[PDB]
Structures are given as structure tokens and as C-alpha cells.
């Protein structure tokens, strides 16, 4: 199971997304492409430079927002989570989404 831990602050901003665990695995490819692409999108398309940490070995990636009032970076985080949520809906057993 891939676990997706999402932190939303009092103002409805996503401050933190942590993805951890593992799902020729297509749920993995799905979540990998959505994660990496979204990060690419945030940095290539917005002002925001998120603080990023990940384990070399896989199963672990952590995004922290710096400018939580960047609407664009936020819209892209919301769209990332919509996308992982979209996969979860058909592969319930292989992703868990969790809000904190």
C-alpha cells in the first residue's frame, strides 16, 4: 500500500504531502507520474520552490510548501490529489489517502 498523508492548514492550504510505501506495477506508475509531474509543474509553472525530500531507494517522497499563498502551486497540489484520489477510487487496496 502507498500511503498519502496530506496536511491542510487553517486557511485551506496544503502544507504537506507525504507519499510512502509501494503499491510492472501500474498503480505505482500512475502515482509516480502524477507525483513527479505535479512537482515539475509547480516549479516550471509557478513562483514557488517547495522544499523536497525523498529517499534514494523509493517508497518515500515529501513535499513541503514554502509559499502557501501561491494560488497556482495550491491549484496544482489540489489537482495532484484529485489525480491520486482518482486512482484510489479504482485501486482502493493499493493507495490510502489520509488528511491531517
Amino acid at each position: 500500500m502507498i500511503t498519502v498523508d496530506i496536511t491542510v492548514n487553517d486557511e485551506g492550504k496544503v502544507t504537506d504531502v507525504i507519499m510512502d510505501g509501494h503499491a510492472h506495477d501500474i498503480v505505482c506508475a500512475g502515482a509516480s507520474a502524477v507525483l513527479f509531474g505535479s512537482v515539475n509543474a509547480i516549479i516550471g509553472l509557478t513562483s514557488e520552490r517547495p522544499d523536497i525530500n525523498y529517499d534514494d531507494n523509493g517508497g518515500h517522497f515529501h513535499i513541503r510548501s514554502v509559499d502557501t499563498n501561491n494560488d497556482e502551486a495550491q491549484l496544482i497540489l489540489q489537482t495532484m490529489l484529485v489525480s491520486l484520489q482518482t486512482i484510489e477510487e479504482e485501486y482502493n487496496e493499493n493507495i490510502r489517502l489520509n488528511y491531517k
Binding site: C28, L35, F36, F61
Partner: peptide, 7 residues
């Protein structure tokens, strides 16, 4: 930047 079996 991408590895498609990272998760």
C-alpha cells in the same frame, strides 16, 4: 526527475 516505479 522521474522514475515510474518509485511507488
Amino acid at each position: 526527475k522521474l522514475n515510474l516505479q518509485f511507488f
